[PDB]
Structure formats: structure tokens, C-alpha cells
Amino acid sequence: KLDHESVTQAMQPKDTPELRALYKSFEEESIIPLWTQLGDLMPIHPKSKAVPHVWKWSTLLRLARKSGELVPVGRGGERRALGLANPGLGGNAYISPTMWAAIQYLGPRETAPEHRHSQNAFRFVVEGEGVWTVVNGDPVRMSRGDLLLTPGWCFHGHMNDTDQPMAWIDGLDIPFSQQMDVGFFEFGSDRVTDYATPNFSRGERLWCHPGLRPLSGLQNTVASPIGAYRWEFTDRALTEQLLLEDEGQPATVAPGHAAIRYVNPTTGGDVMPTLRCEFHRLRAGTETATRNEVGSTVFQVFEGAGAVVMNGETTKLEKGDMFVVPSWVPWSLQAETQFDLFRFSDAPIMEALSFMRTKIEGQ
Amino acid sequence: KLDHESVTQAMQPKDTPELRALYKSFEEESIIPLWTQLGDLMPIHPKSKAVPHVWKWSTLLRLARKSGELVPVGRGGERRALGLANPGLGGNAYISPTMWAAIQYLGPRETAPEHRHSQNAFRFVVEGEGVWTVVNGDPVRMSRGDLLLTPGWCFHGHMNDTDQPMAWIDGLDIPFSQQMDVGFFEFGSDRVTDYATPNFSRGERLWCHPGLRPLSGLQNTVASPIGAYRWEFTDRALTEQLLLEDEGQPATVAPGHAAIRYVNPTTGGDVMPTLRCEFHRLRAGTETATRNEVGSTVFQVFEGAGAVVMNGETTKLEKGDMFVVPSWVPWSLQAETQFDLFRFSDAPIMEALSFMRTKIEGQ
Amino acid sequence: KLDHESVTQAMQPKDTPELRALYKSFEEESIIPLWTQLGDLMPIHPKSKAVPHVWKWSTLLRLARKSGELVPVGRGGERRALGLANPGLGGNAYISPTMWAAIQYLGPRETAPEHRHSQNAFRFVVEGEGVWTVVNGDPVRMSRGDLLLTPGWCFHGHMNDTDQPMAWIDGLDIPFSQQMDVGFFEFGSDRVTDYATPNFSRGERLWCHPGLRPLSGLQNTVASPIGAYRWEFTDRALTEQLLLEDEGQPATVAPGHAAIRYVNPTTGGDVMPTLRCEFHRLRAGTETATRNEVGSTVFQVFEGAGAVVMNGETTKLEKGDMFVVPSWVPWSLQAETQFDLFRFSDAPIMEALSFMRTKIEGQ
Amino acid sequence: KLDHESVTQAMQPKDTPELRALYKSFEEESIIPLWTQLGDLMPIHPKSKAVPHVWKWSTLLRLARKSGELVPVGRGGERRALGLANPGLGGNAYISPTMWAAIQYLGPRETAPEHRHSQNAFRFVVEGEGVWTVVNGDPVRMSRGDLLLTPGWCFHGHMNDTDQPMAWIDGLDIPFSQQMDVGFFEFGSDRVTDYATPNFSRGERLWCHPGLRPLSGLQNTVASPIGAYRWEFTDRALTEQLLLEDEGQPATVAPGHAAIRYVNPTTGGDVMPTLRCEFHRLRAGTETATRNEVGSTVFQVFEGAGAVVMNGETTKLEKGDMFVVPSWVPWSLQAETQFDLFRFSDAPIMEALSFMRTKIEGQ
Ligand SMILES: O=C(O)c1cc(O)ccc1O
Ligand SMILES: O=C(O)c1cc(O)ccc1O
Ligand SMILES: O=C(O)c1cc(O)ccc1O
Ligand SMILES: O=C(O)c1cc(O)ccc1O
Ligand SMILES: [Fe+2]
Ligand SMILES: [Fe+2]
Ligand SMILES: [Fe+2]
Ligand SMILES: [Fe+2]
């Protein structure tokens, strides 16, 4: 089938003074013709400006740690968060066209003051403890393996209750929101509104009992009311899938590939309107079938060792390393040991708007 | 406002030979005129043929136990289940116009053979253990406080793995299904297809991790894929609600009234298309506000002591006792000690069809 | 596969004084055992008490006309409507277990006073004119071929603006509503609230422009806000389908079988929560493939000549004749001339509750 | 309340060699810190790079006409479409961050060859006739006042059947699709696949009968199957609203302001997943209340004379003139004569993702 390089170009006008005058009037009148731009504007398949890229956790940690020494956290700058900037996205602090990802660092006894914004956000922890994030006044402990949510427009601030630093990753729909013009922002309290440090938040104490819904929470929500998806449950779910597979029972998405989607328990859908969160566990030796998927995804290695292949290029990966797969880039994971990864993506956007497509090798 | 007793009856024809001949032709031609039937067919508010009624657990147990002595369980009759028959429903084995409820009794080492039917069903246990119910080949342990589901068209049979008898209650949409003509039925295996007795079923091992969904289970279901809602989770959820109330935090539906709805985790909706299951826990001294609700509900006392008021009549209640509240009958619960009750209803039917109405005293 | 007649009956207790005493205690305690009732309560496939039956329009007209002479219309009896009573439904004025159908007759200058009720209702006209039905104060002309709606809880009354009588058919969910206990009813004005007789109602003037929705009507409704589905549109739609078929283009449901569903334009779904309305037009010679469908349906012949086959029995049909197909009864239509039929059913109930099943001969 | 200009900037590190070295390592490692970017990335309310702007139809026509003389239409460039480029969007052929708008010109007997692409598209006509657009093989006449749809992935080409030129406007989600990486594109036939010029398309002959749905079209669609929303219906709907207002009846969105939304008749929702189309008619003298709305909108004056106010600035408008209102820009319309406008927007994106907000003056 023809592409933009092989098709006949039948709209090539004669290069005369009249043509050049027409084209000068276009500039003056804020007009740009489709016929000179077609192939750029409307590619055969997606061709992102973002490139696949890997950031090493050892490098992220060094830069975050040095930032903890040299930059105080507080009002204005709001957070000591270091955004991952895709080399292909022109100097914008965007890991992909839709998503922001950052390593955030909070030192001994620091607080990061309360604010809210339309942009949706989550926190994920490969390692560490000591921080509580207070979401609409509800303190939520942050620990290794936990997904924490802060849906758009919820007040949130954080405090380190400890004499030891903690780091984690943030994901937000900042780049989508900046480009599409949906951002609103409000400064809240200079200190978190509750310094208490309970083991479990009020949201969890209501919503984290499997298959049960409070009669006071019968209205569905656009975002999950669960503030913490704790490691204990994620680990148990993934283990049970591999055990069910051992027993000859359906459960894994693919052979030796256990995986869950974190969900809004009021609907069974995605945690937030713009962001999908998953967790994958591959047995030693597993090699996933190559996928092309519309929209972008980011993974963080939680545990074990393995590799990612993107555009045919293998990169070895270790605990904490992060990678981005832009739209339609062919990708696969290869597990050396048992290989655990946290994943996020802009797939709820693509699916809501009927733009999603998937190609899987061998099917 | 006028009712059918106080309105003028302006369609009263002269009682002549011609009128009586007209009315005889109506009988011959299978015609029945609205004008002689209006008030019956279309009441001012619902007036059920079912009456409020209470069955004592001590009486249910005696009859079930004697049935265990005198009647063998097996093919044909299928189950040793004793249906609660509303005195107002003309000899039909219906607790309400929509619902069947029964005490079922399975003796030492008995099996009840496998079958399936379009009618949706659940099991609830106030006391006992030893039985496994095998649902589409997945053995599901039955224990005190557990809700077990068997959605329409799932093969199910049960076996007592023990030398001791067990009793439980069944709820089904049998009366709805019989009157509306939606019943299909298929005999399966004469013995259960798996005699293994695991602590937890495969359904639970996949689906009972709070806020997590397997990537192999991304299609929504019409009924919950959770085969067991275990007492441990229900008890914890209800306790946390009362604790949150202690802490000044929203959670209970009403003061001292904790309550959950069992839900399909794929949608956040009801367990099955025709049947809603809830569990309520009232602090000692709680008296619920009087409700009128369209459609019928049945409760079983799980624990504690208290009373129900129906149509203004108080009946004292004990562990295991069962009562039915027909459509639009005013009802309230009064808790003497801490008072725990399992509840089921036909409310998903009423709500699906936009017939639901609720009146709550003092609001 | 086994049925209830061929299965072994393994729950047959020894007929002793102790057994008979047990069974007497069951009666005293309002208990009815499943084992003596199983096959009745839970049939292999639906076996309705309703039977297929045909009512002749010439007979309906004679009885309605005589009723117009002998019975005045007004308060109390409310409407001069003659309900079609299924011979199998025990003297209940029910055409099926879910639906009421009636021929209603309004003589010269009569009014039928305003009321409302939870039961949903529609009017269909095989022939006649002169009546306006005033629905929540909006006068809606009634003419040949028109479907008129009156969703539950809308005030409605009717008046004949003419010196000539008119007859039509009513359909309601009266039998569903009576058996399920969802009926509420309120008397309104003794006269219609607006005697004006516009050609088109306000509802239609807002809602009957194809593919357009008023910005003041962006909230979805549970029932259609279109008060009249006029013959002109139904006829044009059916004709265009047969023309598209002539042109080799997809459109008809089956060869020579044009058909539409009347829909709620806010959702694209059924006109009312409990009732589905369709209109079918078959070319001369068309014989539809035999269907078994869960739930009941009623047709009225609008025009042309043909036959229905039910349970293998052929009945010839003429203009106005009405027939009922109970749940799971095999049925087919045979067209002698071009054959037009209006159809209603309880299918939205069956589909909402996941009870629908369909068997089509040759597929 | 604080904004980014008035808040204290508490994250200002000491400008030392160590800090500058840290910041150099950030560049080297593709890291950009939040603390230097916060206010840009996360504004108090949306602050688009797009600016309000007006393009005159007389200018668009001159440039399109000259393009018809100097540039041939055909393969490669695909369409002689002149995109409206927002002065604030850096040289991108985008009228807003989400939407493309263009004047397209097709001369006597020209054809524009068939292609398809994931990007959704529509055509609107302020004036002219003679072109047919062939959509998945179904020829759709284009005439004054018509909205034509071409949902993503439908093959489409166009041909002028006449010796006279025609111009119209195109709207697409090109800028959304380019930035979010969802574009796929396929070249089809070099000539349209059907040169026939029927008055009405097959889609319309099936789908444009108010409140009726073909039994062969019971599956819902993500986009409307109506290929043409003809002027006749839009005009009648708007007139009826103003008449109902005359009669004291609810209908208009605001006093003297009639308006419709073009809808997908299978769902009652928007025509396509990314684009909302409306048509407004204001009585002489009407001044709409000032709105701020999230996301962008574009209007074209269809008929009459009036003005738009954006950011407090009044611009007088005539037949065919086009304007863009970027996200959150305050806007109002003022009608001198009776004032008719076609409107499109990215609102289905904002609403699907829960980003929509609206401020209306005086409420
Ligand atoms: O609230 C946060 O911690 C936050 C973290 C980020 O990386 C970017 C924006 C934010 O608002
Ligand atoms: O499958 C059962 O245990 C069952 C129990 C009942 O009480 C009634 C019908 C049934 O099919
Ligand atoms: O309102 C009516 O015309 C009506 C007609 C019927 O056949 C039965 C009940 C009703 O309320
Ligand atoms: O198909 C079209 O006519 C078209 C028109 C545009 O203005 C831009 C892209 C397109 O594909
Ligand atoms: Fe934040
Ligand atoms: Fe059963
Ligand atoms: Fe009525
Ligand atoms: Fe195109």
C-alpha cells in the first residue's frame, strides 16, 4: 500500500510570481494550506516526536539526593520533583505527549504544603518509608510497593515523619492538560492539615474490603475513592495468578505472565479519567509477545532483573529503572529472574475517544 | 386526595337484559372491561397479596432436622429445601411475589447433585460448617457468615464433607421467574464434579483483592464472579464503619447504623440482575427511621437481639429468625443488643425498570 | 437430555404416620418443600399459563360499539376499555403475564378524565380519527397509524372533538405491575386541561427533527419525550427499507421483511422501561423464520392479509386482528398481500434482567 | 486567593558552583525540575497559547478562489483546503490546540480522491451546491446549511457534478490527533467509487425518520451513521423553538436563543467522539450571557448580522465569518438582525475526561 513517500504528488503548482504572492497572502492572513502539510499532519501510522528512552534509578537517586542537599522544598516551587524529559519533546518537561513522571524526594521532617489542581496524579514507591500524604484531610501512609492516588481537585500535601529521607515517583497528566488547556490550580494550607500518622487511611477503611460497598457510598465516582493500593494485596493477587496457572487454571494474561489493573471499585474501571495503572509479574524466562499500542506507557522496574526491547533495541534493566514507550512503538519485556514492574499509561484517553488500536505478534 | 373508595363511580350502566347480554358476550369472547376492575388493577399505592410475616429459626430448624431424618436428598426433588410460603400468596411456595427463601439441610456425607437453571440464586449461613458448594467446577467452602452466589446458568451441586449436618438459607428469583416465564433448567452430573475441599475458591483467589482486577478479567459480567463473600471481610467493614463514626468521620448510613451492599466487582453494581444482598449492623439502642420501599425484602437475624416493626406491629427477634416486608409496607428495626442482619431484596428489578420509590420518616 | 418426566425421583419418602405428621406441620408453619414442587417451579424451558390466542377486530368492534351504547364513560371506571383476557390466565384481565391490551372506544364529544399512574402505557390506531389525548397538558392528535405514548406518571385524559366515534388499542404493563406490586395511581382533573386541537404536539415540535436535540433537552429521560410517532414517518421508513433492498443495499432485517423499533431519542433505546414497540412490513409471499423468544409479544394487523403460525397452528388474519405469543412459543408470520403489523412486547424487562434468549429456525 | 505571581517562592536555591553543576547534570540526564517550571505547567486557570481570532469570509473566499486558479487538486496533497492557523500556535496549522478548520474549494467537474484516516471530520456549508461527497461508497449531496459527517476510518472522496465551483468548511480533530499520536491514514481509490448523484444518501434513507430505528441497526455506534444533517430540519427545529417561546412554552435555551445539538441517533450523544456540533439562532437584539468554558470552540456565521465579544473585545460579524474561542476565554454573542451560527467544539473530549467547567455571568 502507498505511503506519503511513494504516493504521486499531484498538487504541485507552477512556481510563478502569482503563486508566491498567493503564498505570501496566506502568511499575512493566518492561512496554512493542507497540500504542503498533508503527510506531516496525517501520517500512515503514529510517528511520535517522543522517543523510547530509559532512565536509570541509580542516576535518578543521585540527582534527587543532591537536590535534597541544595534545594529547599516549600511554597511556590511546591515539590522537590525532578521531571523526566523526553529528548524528543523539544525541551518540554514531558516524558510522553500526555504524561509527566518524576522522582520526588522528601528529606527528614520536611513538609510539602497543600494544594489542588485539575491534573490527576498518583504516587508509586519502589523503595522507602516514612512519608504520609494527606489527601482532602485524610492521612495516607506511603510504603514500598504502594500505589497512592490523588485525583484531580483533591487537596494534598505530604510530610516526612522520620529522620530518614524518602523518594518515590509521581505520575500526572500535566502534558495533556497543558497542551489541551484544562489546568486549574489552587494553593492550600502551608502545612498539612493533619500530622497524624495512622497505618491505614479512612478511604481504605471504608473501601478496601473485597466485594463490599458502604451504603453511604452508593453514588459512583469519576475517580477511585481508594487512596492507597497497598503492596500486600498486589503481591498476593499476582502470586495467586501464578499458583492458579500451576494448577492448570485460567488466570494469567499470557503464559508465566501475571498482571492486574488497579481499578475504581465504584465502576470496575480505571483509577482516574486520564491514567491507567497496572502491575505485572513475569516468571524467570518469560518473553512477552511484541505489542504495538496507540498512546504512551511508562514502566518502573519494582524488583528482579530483565530487559525491555523497543524498536528492536534491547536495554537491560534493574530495580527502579524507568522507561517510556511512545505511541505505536513495538515493545516486549524479557524476564531474567522473576521480574516485577509497575506500569502507567494514557490508555483511558485513547479508549474513551475510540482511538485505541493494538497489534500483538503472532495473533 | 380521592381514592378508589371515595371517588364517584360514573360508569355504572343500567342493569337491563341488553347489558347482561353484553356482559355474557364478554365472557364468551375473553373480554374483561376495565370499568368493573379499575381500582383492583390500579391501586392508589401498592397493596400486596403478600403479608408481613416472621418465621422462627427454632421452628425452621426442627422441621429441617425432621426432614433430614425422613426424606432422602438426590435426583428429581434435587434439594432438601423447605420454602417459606407467604400466607397471603394463595398456596404458592413464594415468600414474596418475586422471591423464594428456604432453609436447606444437608446431612453427614450427603451430596446434592449438579444442575443449572436461568433462576439466580445465593446461599447464606447464620451458623454451621462442613459443606462445599461446587460452582461450574470450582469448590466453594460454606461457613458461618458467608454469602455464596450461584448466578443463573452456573452448574452447581453441594456435598457435606463431614459427619455433622449443616443448614443454611437459599434465596432465588423463582417466583418472579415462574410468573414471568423465564425459567430454563438442565440436569448435570449425579455427583459433584470435584470433591476437593480447598479453603478458598478459584474465583476468590482471582477476584477478592481489594481494588485489583486481573488483566484476564477485563470484560464486565452481568453477575459477580466472586463465589464467596466471606464473613471475615463483612465483619471488618462493619466494624470500621462504627469506628469511623466514633472518630467523627462519615461512614454509617445513619447514626449507629453500619451497612454494606455486596457488589459485582466488575461494575460496582448488584450481585445478580434480580437480587440485592446487604448486611446491616446496628449498635445497641438504634431504632431505624420507618421506611416504605417499592418491592419486597427479606432479612435474617445473624446475631444479637432486637425487633422489627411492620405495619406498626412489633415482633421480637432472635438469631436466625426471618421476616418478609412486602412492597410499600412501613418497616423499622430496633436493636436491643448489637444487632446484625443479612438482607436480600428484589430492588434491582424495581430500579432497572424505574419503579422504585422510597418514603423515609422525618425526611 | 433428561426432563422432569424422565428423571429418576430419588426424594420419595416412605409414606408413614411420621411423614404425614411432618407434612401437616409444614402446612401449619407456612412451609412448602421444594422436593414435591421442583418440576413445576423450575421447568426445562418456559411453559406459560397463557396460551396463544387471536381476537378478531370485527368482534372487538361489535363489543366496543355496544359498550358505547350501554355504558357511559367518566370518573371511577375511568375509560371504556375492553381488556383482552388470556383464556389461560385464570380470569385475570391479562393478555399475557406482563401485558394488558384493550380496545378503547370514545363516542362523539365524550371526554375521559385526567389521571396518572406508575404503569406505563401507549395507544395505537389501526383506523379512525377525532380524538386528542392530552398528556401533561400537551394535546396530542390521534390518527390512523399513529403510536401515542403516555409514560408512567404523566397526567393524561382524552376528548373526542368530533360527532363520530373513534376506537384504538391500549397497551400497558398492568399485569406486571399488579403482580410485582409497583402500582401507584392519582385522580386528576374531571375534564382535560386543554381542549385545543393542534395538528402536532409540543413534544413533537421539539423532538421530531431527525438527528437534532434541543439544547434545553440535554438530560436523558427514562422514557421517550415524543408523544406521537406519526404514521407518515413509519410508512416512509418501511418503504425506504424495501427500496434499499431493491437497490441491493442492506436495510431489511430479513429478505422482504422491513421493520423499525420505536425509540426514545435521548438514548436510542426502548420507548418505555417495560414495553417495546415495533412496526413490521412484509412483502407479499414473505414467510418469516420461526422464532422462539423469552417473554410475550402482541401484534395488531394494520393492513393487508396473511397468517400467523403459533405452536404449528395457522390462523388467517385480517386488518385489526390481534394475537398474543406467550414466552417461548414458536411463531412465524406469512404474508399473502403486503402485510403491515404493529407489535409490542415485554422484551425490555427480559433484556434488562439478562433473561432474554432467542431461537431462530435455520440459524 | 494567591496566584503564581503573588505566592512566596520558597524553593530558591543558593546560586553556587555546586547548584549550577547540579543543573548542568539535569540537562545531561534529561531531567527538568518542577520547582523552576511550576506556574507554567500548572496555571491557576487555563491560559491558552491560542488567541481569540476572527477570519472574514470575504478574505477566505478570495484566497480559496485564487487557489482554485493556481493549484490543481488530486493525489498527495489530497484536498485544496486552506487551514485556519491560530496566530498564537507557533506556525502549526491549528485553529485551536484540538481542532483544525479549513475553507475547502472544489472547482467545476473536479474530483478529490478517496482516502481514510483515524481523524474524525465534518463538512459545513454556508453557501453553494454541486458537490457530492461519497462516504464508504454512499453518495451524499452537499447543499447550503447542511452538516456532513465523515467519522474516523470511513473512506471518503468528493466530486463536483457541475460547471460551477463550490466552497465549504471542514472541521477535524487533526491537532489533537497529531499531538496525542493517534493518526493512521490510508490512500483509497484515485476516483470516487460512485459518481451517482442521488438527492438523499442511503444513510439518511435509513436513519433520518424521527424516533425510528431499523431492526437491522440495533447495535449502537461510536459515531453517528447519519451522513447528512440537512438544512430543512435544522431550520424547522429552530423555528419551532422560537414559536414555542412565543406561545409561553419551554424550548429555547435562553430568552430569544434557539439552539440544537446534532446527535448520534443510536445513543443521543455527540456526532463523533472528539467533536460536538451545534446550531444557534438568536432573535434580533439578543445578547447572550458571557460564558467561560473549558476547551475551544469555533463558530461560522450562517446568516444575519451581529457581533462576538471575546476577552471584552467586540468584533462585528457577517455571513460566513469564522471565529475561535480558546479555552476559558469569556465570550458572548450579540444579534443585530436574526443571527444564525453553526458551532463546533472539542467539548466531548473535555466531558469524557471530567475536565469540563463552565462559568455563566449572572448564575
Ligand atoms: O503534588 C505533587 O506531589 C506533585 C508532584 C509532581 O511531580 C508534579 C506536580 C505535583 O503537584
Ligand atoms: O440449587 C439449590 O440448592 C436450590 C435451593 C433452593 O432452595 C431452590 C432451588 C435450588 O436450585
Ligand atoms: O388511560 C387510559 O386510557 C387507560 C386505558 C386502558 O386500557 C387501561 C388503563 C388506562 O389508564
Ligand atoms: O477529506 C477531506 O476533505 C479533508 C479536509 C481537510 O480540510 C483536512 C483533511 C481532510 O482529509
Ligand atoms: Fe500536586
Ligand atoms: Fe439450584
Ligand atoms: Fe391511564
Ligand atoms: Fe479526509
**DSSP string spanning B203-243?**
HHHHH-STTEEEGGG-S--SS-S--EE-HHHHHHHHHHHHH
Give the atom of ligand 2 at the shortest distance from the alpha carbon of B157: 1
**Cα-to-centroid distance, C356 and ligand 2 (Å):** 22
Q: Which of A105, A98, A100, A36 is nearest to A68 (CA)?
A: A105
Q: Which residues of C touch D249 (CB under 8 A)?
A: 202
Classify each residue of A318-340 as buried b or exposed e, where b means 16 or more C-beta atoms within 10 Å of its C-beta: eebbbbbbbbbbbbbbbbeebbb
The DSSP element (H or E) to which D178 belongs, if any, is helix D174-180
Cα-based angle B144, B148, B151 (whole degrees, multiple of 5): 170
Residues constituting chain C: 363
Cell numbers representing residue B166 in the block:
449443616
CA dihedral C151, C156, C162, C163 (to 10 degrees): 110
Alpha-carbon distance of C9 to A181, in angstroms, equals: 72
Place of cell 470484560: B219
Residue carrying the nine cell digits 478562489: D65
Give the Cα separation of D334 and D301 in Å (integer). Answer: 12
Nearest to D215 by CA among D207, D223, D226, D203: D207
Question: Determination method here?
Answer: X-ray
* Residue D363: C-alpha distances to residues D202, D245, D289 (Å): 45, 21, 9
DSSP string computed for A177-193 = HHHHT---EEE--SS-S
Helix/strand/coil (H/E/C) assignment for every residue in chain C: CCCCCCCCCCCCCCCCHHHHHHHHHHHHCCEEEHHHCHHHHCCCCCCCCCCCEEECHHHHHHHHHHHHHHCCCCCCCCCCEEEECCCCCCCCCCCCCCCEEEEEEECCCCEEEEEEECCCEEEECCCCEEEEEEECCEEEEEECCCEEEECCCCCEEEEECCCCCEEEEEEECHHHHHHHCCCCEEECCCCCCCCCCCCCCHHHHHHCCCCEEECCCCCCCCCCCCCEECHHHHHHHHHHHHHHHHCCCCCCCECCEEEEEEECCCCCCECCCCCEEEEEEECCCCECCCEEECCCEEEEEEECCEEEEECCEEEEECCCCEEEECCCCCEEEEECCCEEEEEEECHHHHHHCCCCCEEECCC
The rounded distance, in Å, linking the Cα atoms of B175 and B179 is 6
**3+ Cβ–Cβ pairs closer than 8 Å linking A and C:** no
D303 vs D337: CA distance, rounded Å: 9
Contact between D328 and D46 under an 8 Å Cβ cutoff? The reply is yes
Q: Is D102 in the pocket of ligand 4 (CB under 6 A)?
A: yes
| Mutation site for D-interface testing, chosen from C140, C199, C208, C209 by largest number of D Cβ within 10 Å | C209
Give the nearest partner residue to C185 out of B35, B43, B346, using CB atoms: B43
Q: Helix or strand or coil: residue A60?
A: helix
Please give the single-letter amino acid code of residue B277. Answer: C
Ligand 1 centroid–CA A129 distance in Å is 18
Task: Name the residue facing B10 among C34, C36, C74 (closest C-beta).
Answer: C74
Confirm if B142 and B178 have CB atoms less than 8 A apart. Answer: no
Residue C248 burial by Cβ neighbours in a 10 Å radius (0-12, 13-18, 19+) = exposed
**In chain D, whose CA is at the least distance from the CA of C224?**
D211
The answer to whether the CB of A79 is under 6 A from ligand 1 is: yes
Q: Are A63 and D22 in contact (CB under 8 A)?
A: yes
Q: What architecture is domain B16-363? A: Sandwich (2.60)
Q: Is chain B touching chain D, with at least 3 CB–CB pairs below 8 Å?
A: no
Q: In angstroms, what is the span from residue B222 Cα to ligand 6's centroid? A: 18
- CB atoms B47 and C181 under 8 Å: yes
d(CA D350, CA A180): 9
Over its C-alpha atoms, chain C yields an Rg (Å, rounded) of 23
In angstroms, the CA A212 to CA B262 distance is 5
Question: For ligand 3, is residue C104 a contact (CB within 6 Å)?
Answer: yes
Nine-digit cell string for C102: 384493550
Nearest CA among B289, B285, B281 for reference residue B339: B281
Closest by Cβ to D295, choosing from A43, A67, A181: A181
C20 backbone dihedrals φ, ψ, rounded to 5°: -65, -35
Burial (CB count within 10 angstroms: exposed 0-12, middle 13-18, buried 19+), residue C1: exposed
How many Å apart are CA B212 and CA D311, to the nearest integer?
A: 47
- Coil, helix or strand for A121? strand
CB-based burial of residue A248 (10 Å sphere; 0-12 exposed, 13-18 middle, 19+ buried)? exposed
Residue with cell 529503572: A321
Reduced to 3 states, what is the DSSP secondary structure of residue A203?
A: helix
Q: Do A244 and B220 touch (CB under 8 A)?
A: no
Q: Which residue has the cell 492448570?
A: A248
Instruction: Please give the full DSSP string across B127-145, using - where no structure is assigned.
Output: S-EEEEEEETTEEEEEETT
Distance from CA of D39 to the nearest CA of A (A): 8
Pick the residue of C136, C253, C260, C270 with the most D CBs within 10 A to test the interface with D by mutation. Answer: C260
Q: Name the amino acid, one letter, at B70.
A: L
Strands D257-262 and C212-214: antiparallel
CA pair distance C232, D151, nearest whole angstrom: 30
How far, in Å, are A27, A115, A323, B154 from residue A326 at the CA level?
Answer: 33, 30, 10, 43
Those residues with Cβ within 8 angstroms of residue D230's Cβ, 6 or more apart along the chain or in another chain: D143, D145, D146, D204, D208
* Burial (CB count within 10 angstroms: exposed 0-12, middle 13-18, buried 19+), residue B141: buried
Whether residue A45 is annotated as binding a ligand: the answer is no
How are beta strands B100-106 and B81-84 bridged, if at all? antiparallel
CB atoms within 10 A of CB A126: 21
Asked if D291 and C240 touch (Cβ cutoff 8 Å), the reply is: no
| Set of cell numbers at residue A349 | 484517553
Mutate to test the pocket of ligand 2, among B60, B73, B78, B119 (most ligand atoms within 8 A of CB): B78
Q: How many Cβ atoms are within 10 Å of B202's Cβ, its own excluded?
A: 23
Q: Measured between alpha carbons, how far is residue A91 from residues A84, B109, D28, D29, D33 in Å?
A: 11, 73, 12, 12, 12
Instruction: Say yes or no for a CB contact (<8 Å) between D76 and A9.
Output: yes
Quote the cell numbers at residue D179. Answer: 499531538
Between CA A296 and CA A305, with CA A301 as vertex, the angle to 5 degrees is 130
Closest CA to D169 of D68, D107, D71, D83: D83
The conformation of residue A1, written as its DSSP 8-state character, comes to -
The identity of residue D58, as a single letter, is S
Grid cell 468548511 — which residue? Answer: D169
Residue tagged 359498550 (cell numbers): C67
Cα angle: C27, vertex C28, C30; to 5 degrees? 65
D336 strand-pairing partners: none
Distance between CA A127 and CA A109 in Å, rounded?
A: 18
Q: Kindly tell me the sign of the dihedral angle through the C-alpha atoms of B171, B172, B173, B179.
A: negative
Distance linking the first and last C-alpha atoms of chain A: 21
Q: Are C329 and C310 in contact (CB under 8 A)?
A: yes
- Is A276 touching ligand 1 by the criterion CB < 6 Å? no
Question: What is the DSSP code (8-state) at residue D252?
Answer: S
Mutation test of ligand 3: which of C78, C155, C160 has the most ligand atoms closer than 8 Å to its C-beta?
C78
Residue of B nearest to A240 (CA): B205
- Regarding the beta carbon of C79 and ligand 3, being less than 6 Å apart is answered yes
Which one of C35, C95, C106, C114 makes the best mutation probe of the B interface by having the most chain B beta carbons within 10 Å? Answer: C35
Cβ contacts of B221 on chain A, cutoff 8 Å: none
Cβ-based neighbours of C141, under 8 Å, separated by 6 or more: C129, C132, C197, C198, C199, C200, C201, C228
Give me ligand 8 centre to Cα D351, in Å: 25
Among all chains, which residue has been given the C-alpha cell 496525542? D180
In angstroms, rounded to a whole number, what is the distance separating the alpha carbons of residues A190 and A169? 22
Of A218, A234, A265, the CB nearest to B265: A265
- Integer Cα distance of D287 and C54 in angstroms: 61
Domain ranges in chain C are: 16-363
User: Is residue C110 a contact partner of residue C73, using CB atoms and an 8 Å limit?
Assistant: yes
| Residue A163 buriedness (CB in 10 A; 0-12 / 13-18 / 19+) | exposed
Q: Edge to edge, what strands does the sheet with D331-335 contain? A: D313-317, D306-310, D331-335, D291-293, D358-360
End-to-end Cα, chain B, rounded Å: 21
Distance between CA atoms of D47 and D50, rounded to whole angstroms?
A: 9
Which residue in A has a C-alpha nearest to residue B205's C-alpha? A240
Q: How far apart are CA B336 and CA A351, in angstroms?
A: 53
Task: Tell the burial category of B199 from Cβ atoms under 10 Å away from its Cβ (0-12, 13-18, 19+).
Answer: exposed
Among residues B237, B206, B265, the alpha carbon closest in space to that of A200 is found at: B237
Measured CA to CA, the distance from residue B53 to residue B64 in angstroms comes to: 19
Whether B291 and B345 have beta carbons less than 8 Å apart is answered as no
Contact D90, D170 (CB under 8 A): no
| Burial status of residue A243 (CB atoms within 10 A of its CB: 0-12, 13-18, 19 or more) | middle
**By the 8 A CB rule, do A100 and D47 touch?**
no
Grid-cell match 417451579, residue found: C41
Distance CA A104, CA C290 (A): 67
Is the distance from the beta carbon of residue C81 to the nearest atom of ligand 3 less than 6 Å?
A: yes
- Residue D218 has a CB neighbour count (10 Å cut-off) of 12
Residues whose CB is less than 8 angstroms from the CB of residue A349 and which lie 6 or more positions away in sequence, other chains included: A98, A176, A274, A295, A355, D180, D353
* Cβ atoms of C258 and C280 closer than 8 Å: yes
What is the strand order of the sheet C339-345 is part of? C53-55, C322-325, C297-303, C339-345, C276-282, C257-262, D212-214
Task: Give the number of other Cβ atoms within 10 Å of residue A212's Cβ.
Answer: 23
Cell numbers standing for residue B340? 446484625
* Strand-pair partners of D254: D257
Q: Are D279 and D235 in contact (CB under 8 A)?
A: no
- Using a threshold of 3 CB pairs under 8 A, tell whether chains C and B touch: yes
Q: Chain A residue closest to D48 (CA)?
A: A181
**Phi and psi (nearest 5°) for B178?**
-65, -50
The DSSP result for D262-283, as a single string, is: EB-TTTSSBSSSS-EEEEEEE-
Q: Residue D277: its chain C contacts at CB < 8 A? A: none
CA dihedral defined by B27, B32, B33, B36, rounded to 10 degrees?
Answer: 90
Give Cα D162 distance to the centre of its chain. 28
**Site from A212, A224, A234, A351 to mutate, B interface, most B CB atoms within 10 angstroms:** A212
Q: Reading across the β-sheet that carries D339-345, which strands appear in turn?
A: C212-214, D257-262, D276-282, D339-345, D297-303, D322-325, D53-55
What distance in Å separates the CA atoms of residue C175 and residue B181, rounded to the nearest whole number? 13
With contacts defined as CB-CB under 8 Å, which chain A residues touch D71?
Answer: 11, 13, 19, 33, 35
**Distances from the Cα of A269 to the Cαs of B273, C186, D235, in angstroms?**
20, 42, 41
Cell of B161: 464433607
C-alpha cell at A3: 505511503
Which ligand 4 atom is nearest residue A41's CA? Answer: 9
D209 DSSP assignment: S
How many residue contacts between B and C have a Cβ separation below 8 Å? 316
Q: Are C137 and C96 in contact (CB under 8 A)?
A: no
DSSP A18: H
Cell of D338: 436574526
Residue among C185, C183, C172 nearest C94 (CA): C172
Cell, residue D343? 458551532
Closest CA to B214 of C155, A233, C69, C116: A233
Separation between Cα atoms, residue D295 and residue C105, nearest integer Å: 56
CA–CA separation, B256 and B236 (whole Å): 16
**Between the CA of residue A228 and those of A201, B353, C82, D228, what are the distances in Å?**
8, 36, 63, 49
- CB contacts of A218 in chain B (<8 Å) are 261
Strand order in the sheet with B185-187: B138-143, B129-135, B156-160, B111-117, B185-187
D151/D177 Cα distance (integer angstroms): 14
CB C139 within 8 A of CB C197: yes
- Beta-bridged to residue C281, according to DSSP, are C258, C340
The DSSP secondary-structure symbol of B353 reads: T
Judging contacts by C-beta atoms under 8 Å, the chain D residues touching residue A223 are: 354
Q: Report the residue of chain D nearest C227, measured CA to CA.
A: D211
